Amino acid sequence: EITAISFDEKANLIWSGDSYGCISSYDPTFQLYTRYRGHIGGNSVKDILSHRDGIL
Amino acid sequence: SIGRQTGTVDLLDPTSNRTIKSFNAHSASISAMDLRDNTLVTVGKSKRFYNLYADPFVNVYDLRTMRQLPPVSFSKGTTMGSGGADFVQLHPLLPTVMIVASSSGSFDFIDLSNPTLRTQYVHPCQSIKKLCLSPNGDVLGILEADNHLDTWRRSSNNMGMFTNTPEMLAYP
Amino acid sequence: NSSASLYVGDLEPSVSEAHLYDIFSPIGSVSSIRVCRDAITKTSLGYAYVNFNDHEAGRKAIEQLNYTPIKGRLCRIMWSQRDPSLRKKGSGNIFIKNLHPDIDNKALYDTFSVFGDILSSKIATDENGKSKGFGFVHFEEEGAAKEAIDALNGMLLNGQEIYVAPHLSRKERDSQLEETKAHYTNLYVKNINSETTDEQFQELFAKFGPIVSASLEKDADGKLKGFGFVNYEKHEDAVKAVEALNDSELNGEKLYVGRAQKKNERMHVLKKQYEAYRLEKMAKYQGVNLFVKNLDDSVDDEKLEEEFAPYGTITSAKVMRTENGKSKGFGFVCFSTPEEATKAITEKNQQIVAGKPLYVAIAQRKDVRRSQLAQQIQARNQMRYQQATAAAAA
Amino acid sequence: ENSSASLYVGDLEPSVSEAHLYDIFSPIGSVSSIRVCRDAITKTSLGYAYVNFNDHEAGRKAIEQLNYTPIKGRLCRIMWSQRDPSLRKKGSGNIFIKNLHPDIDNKALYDTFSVFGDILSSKIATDENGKSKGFGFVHFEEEGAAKEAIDALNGMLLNGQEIYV
């Protein structure tokens, strides 16, 4: 259901959005770090990007 | 850049905000575009309905003096259909060298200047949703809806991604 | 009631707190060393502080080590409890002046400790021991200092008096060398009529500085230059008639009094010229000039002026070279037009003139240091990311 | 200034990219950022690169592993970074030589000649299978180490060829 992907420039995390509502960060090869929402509802996310300070 | 409804690119200044150039990359779509060091890569489809025709050429443009750089043709890989260069992405540390990848995954580490120097890494697995990069230059991330990554490169590091400063590293 | 928190002044950058610990570790109670690396670029403020758990060992380390050479420079270790109050009071280092140029804080400290423990003692002891013959000595407080004033004002000390009565400015060993009865900065009065004689240079001028020597300056050409040297008593009266008798009337004619042969005890004339150059030195352009670097070598002021002829009134075309030989990239055209310079920001920035591109920025030696600050920033940043990488890389 | 790498290659090419460049010193670790900033109407050589690493010590480490070995005729030049107060930093001139010895390289040149004078740019004409072309430009930080190396031995006899001012 994964619908948007980006990195972070400062860690080994992955930043994924499924089709459930969420946005998650991921450790190396098979481990998650966080999964939060900044999303209202419906589908999760159009797109994801990295930044100097955080994740948009 | 404005990758637009009809495969075209209106390029503008965020500062002066006068229209200077309405380039026309394709006629139908614009899907895979990057702007790095006054160089522009784009591939979208250009055929309307019976198409299967994500365009079999990497359309290369520059920001230097408004010129169509010679478009590198994209092969059909191994399959019998069209080329389909729907994933074209310049390298982070090498802002002209790119990676071009199809829907099934015929990805190639490829120069901008010399198209002969191609590294046509085949994909002995299932077709993709998306793929991402390597700021450490040695990380293939193929990602479908399966949540199972694999990197294909030589084993320069035991590391995954770039950097190692986590604010809750292994212990909150 | 602090145990000990002690002033250590007139330092040199070799003395770290490791070296201070190696000095004061056989004193007995080492608490801490506040090296005053002030937070601009770790510079000393001229001093530092050492804190001791023992008040007695602190008094010990003062009275043993006051102008003793810690790594080759004499240690100005005193009290500074009232010294932030001397900071935000204006008081502190008073002007016990005409000191001795061969006696430092240690010998005069142990000499006039009968006048008191000098809480703010300095002589002009720069240059690894050389005093210029004066300094800012001040005792405990007003009573001990006034006791030293009323007890010793004009006494003998190796054939030299002291002067705390007046706030005597620098060059005091060579004060009488300035006061020597032959040399003096005269006053050239320009465009004098021939009516002024040696009598006339003493009439209205001896009040503004007494004159015996009054010379109607004829030149080596027989005539008058119109410039006559007024020989007052002191260079301050040279000041008084350069900025009080300026274009004045002696009888009926001008007194354009300039300083005939300045002896440097009054100074800073045209140093504002410097700041006038600060209108155009590091804030270079005033949106007018163009630091155009990276020409061709065939691009002289010839081809620079040739390119900038459509770009307004050219006033200064100038390329510095290896002694009018090899330029290492850069020229300048001071314009007279700012909007043609904006047209060059459009055009002549990102411009091939011959084969190699023009480079346009405002010309400063100022923020080279700020760029080095940014280099420090990025250096500590890559150090930090490498520290995190080597930490979590296991 | 320039406490970091700032590793400055000059005397550049029109149309050879940084691709094989990054191919060669890949296994060294610290390769931070490589870029040639450019003019707008300019697909010819202009003359400044930035093979930037993290710190200066990574540049010296890149020297100390292996440096100045011939591939594609180009040899990577070192950090200069020297602008309009440097009218004569590396422009205080050089000995220009007619009849250098025809075996004079740059590496053994500065290796034996690190004693008297520090050579900045030994702009030496070496071509056609190990042959210094007689004319060269041995270049310094001043014109004083130049005179030091001349007055020591302005060249010497190893196969006899003294060099020129």
mmCIF file of N, CA, C and O in Angstrom, chain B residues 159 162-165 169, chain C residues 384-385 388-389 392-393:
data_model
loop_
_atom_site.group_PDB
_atom_site.id
_atom_site.type_symbol
_atom_site.label_atom_id
_atom_site.label_comp_id
_atom_site.label_asym_id
_atom_site.label_seq_id
_atom_site.Cartn_x
_atom_site.Cartn_y
_atom_site.Cartn_z
ATOM 1 N N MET B 159 27.786 -0.548 6.126
ATOM 2 C CA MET B 159 26.782 0.448 6.461
ATOM 3 C C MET B 159 25.647 0.413 5.440
ATOM 4 O O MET B 159 25.798 -0.075 4.318
ATOM 5 N N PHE B 162 23.611 7.000 4.741
ATOM 6 C CA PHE B 162 24.728 7.932 4.846
ATOM 7 C C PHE B 162 25.221 8.075 6.287
ATOM 8 O O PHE B 162 26.386 7.774 6.569
ATOM 9 N N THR B 163 24.399 8.593 7.199
ATOM 10 C CA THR B 163 24.912 9.206 8.424
ATOM 11 C C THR B 163 24.384 8.484 9.664
ATOM 12 O O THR B 163 23.513 7.615 9.584
ATOM 13 N N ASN B 164 24.973 8.814 10.818
ATOM 14 C CA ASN B 164 24.873 7.983 12.022
ATOM 15 C C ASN B 164 24.682 8.830 13.287
ATOM 16 O O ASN B 164 25.356 8.628 14.298
ATOM 17 N N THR B 165 23.766 9.799 13.254
ATOM 18 C CA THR B 165 23.454 10.626 14.428
ATOM 19 C C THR B 165 21.958 10.558 14.754
ATOM 20 O O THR B 165 21.183 11.414 14.321
ATOM 21 N N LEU B 169 19.088 6.814 19.671
ATOM 22 C CA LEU B 169 19.799 5.696 19.049
ATOM 23 C C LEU B 169 19.790 4.477 19.964
ATOM 24 O O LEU B 169 20.495 4.434 20.975
ATOM 25 N N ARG C 384 31.837 16.774 14.010
ATOM 26 C CA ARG C 384 30.704 16.241 14.757
ATOM 27 C C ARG C 384 30.066 15.058 14.039
ATOM 28 O O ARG C 384 29.766 14.031 14.661
ATOM 29 N N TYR C 385 29.851 15.189 12.727
ATOM 30 C CA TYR C 385 29.274 14.083 11.965
ATOM 31 C C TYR C 385 30.220 12.894 11.890
ATOM 32 O O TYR C 385 29.762 11.747 11.915
ATOM 33 N N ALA C 388 29.884 11.174 15.338
ATOM 34 C CA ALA C 388 28.669 10.364 15.368
ATOM 35 C C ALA C 388 28.792 9.126 14.484
ATOM 36 O O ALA C 388 28.293 8.051 14.841
ATOM 37 N N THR C 389 29.465 9.260 13.337
ATOM 38 C CA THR C 389 29.648 8.137 12.424
ATOM 39 C C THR C 389 30.538 7.064 13.035
ATOM 40 O O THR C 389 30.212 5.874 12.992
ATOM 41 N N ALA C 392 28.399 5.405 16.109
ATOM 42 C CA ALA C 392 27.321 4.481 15.778
ATOM 43 C C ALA C 392 27.674 3.517 14.653
ATOM 44 O O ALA C 392 26.827 2.704 14.269
ATOM 45 N N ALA C 393 28.894 3.582 14.116
ATOM 46 C CA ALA C 393 29.276 2.730 12.996
ATOM 47 C C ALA C 393 29.510 1.279 13.394
ATOM 48 O O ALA C 393 29.586 0.420 12.509
#
